[PDB]
Amino acid sequence: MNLPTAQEVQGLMARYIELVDVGDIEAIVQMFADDATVEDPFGQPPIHGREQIAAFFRQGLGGGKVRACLTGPVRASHNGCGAMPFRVEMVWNGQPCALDVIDVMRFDEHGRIQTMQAYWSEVNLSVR
Amino acid sequence: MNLPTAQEVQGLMARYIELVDVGDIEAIVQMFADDATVEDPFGQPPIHGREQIAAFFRQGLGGGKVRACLTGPVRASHNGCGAMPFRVEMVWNGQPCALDVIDVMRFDEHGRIQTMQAYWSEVNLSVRE
Ligand SMILES: [Cl-]
Ligand SMILES: [Cl-]
Ligand SMILES: [Mg+2]
Ligand SMILES: [Mg+2]
């Protein structure tokens, strides 16, 4: 509970996708530190504020049917950071779709997230 | 090339992995901006400039026997950045091992790598496959 060790990073990151897949918005939002920023998709301004991280997520996961799965292991550093590949199954244009995503996270001392960057574009989005 | 779009970033990144996979250390370096910054592994201090970058890559790759392959699609942005998952197979002490990596690249307006972060560690080395 201090800065996560690489093995522990592999744990918080993978929690984090479970939770997202099970749809627990409230549990997602206790993972973020108070000053934490969300860039999703990377390219677009950091979000920020705990009401605001919680409206972000509630806009993405509210309607309960999203499924998110890792598609390879969590790469983890020794300075409390990591990156992961995954896929998301969602709805676009009324129809089911997927989306391949990569997250990079830094974990502050308190084992909470501080930055989250998500990489994807249309170029990753596939209609099923 | 100017800043790269998203489709252009997917293609630049995938070529980096080939060039790595074939071991053309001058062609790799030349993908980088003249003043580019490598952090590999992210967290060890940034390797700066093509001289230093060349010394780095020669020391990883010059021994031979490294092969590198993507393991899913490149995740691109519209601000010339991306991210890709890949696996590096090598031979250590004559035992083969696999290393799972994600590189994160930021490209300039010539379409040269400005900055490369490589996320991995010792969790990510697996010495039976
Ligand atoms: Cl992977
Ligand atoms: Cl993937
Ligand atoms: Mg090849
Ligand atoms: Mg320049």
UniProtKB/Swiss-Prot annotation, chain A:
Keyword Ribonucleoprotein: no
GO terms for MF: steroid Delta-isomerase activity
Induction or repression: By steroids.
Disulfide bond annotation, renumbered to this chain: none
Consequence of substituting residue 16 to F: Reduces activity 2000-fold. Reduces activity 10000-fold
Active site residues of this protein: 16, 40
Result of altering residue 125 to A: Slightly reduces activity and reduces protein stability
Consequence recorded when altering residue 127 to A: Slightly reduces activity and reduces protein stability
Residues that coordinate or bind substrate: 103
Catalytic activity entry: a 3-oxo-Delta(5)-steroid = a 3-oxo-Delta(4)-steroid
Biological process per Gene Ontology, one example term: steroid metabolic process
EC number: 5.3.3.1
Subunit structure, interactors included: Homodimer.
Protein name: Steroid Delta-isomerase
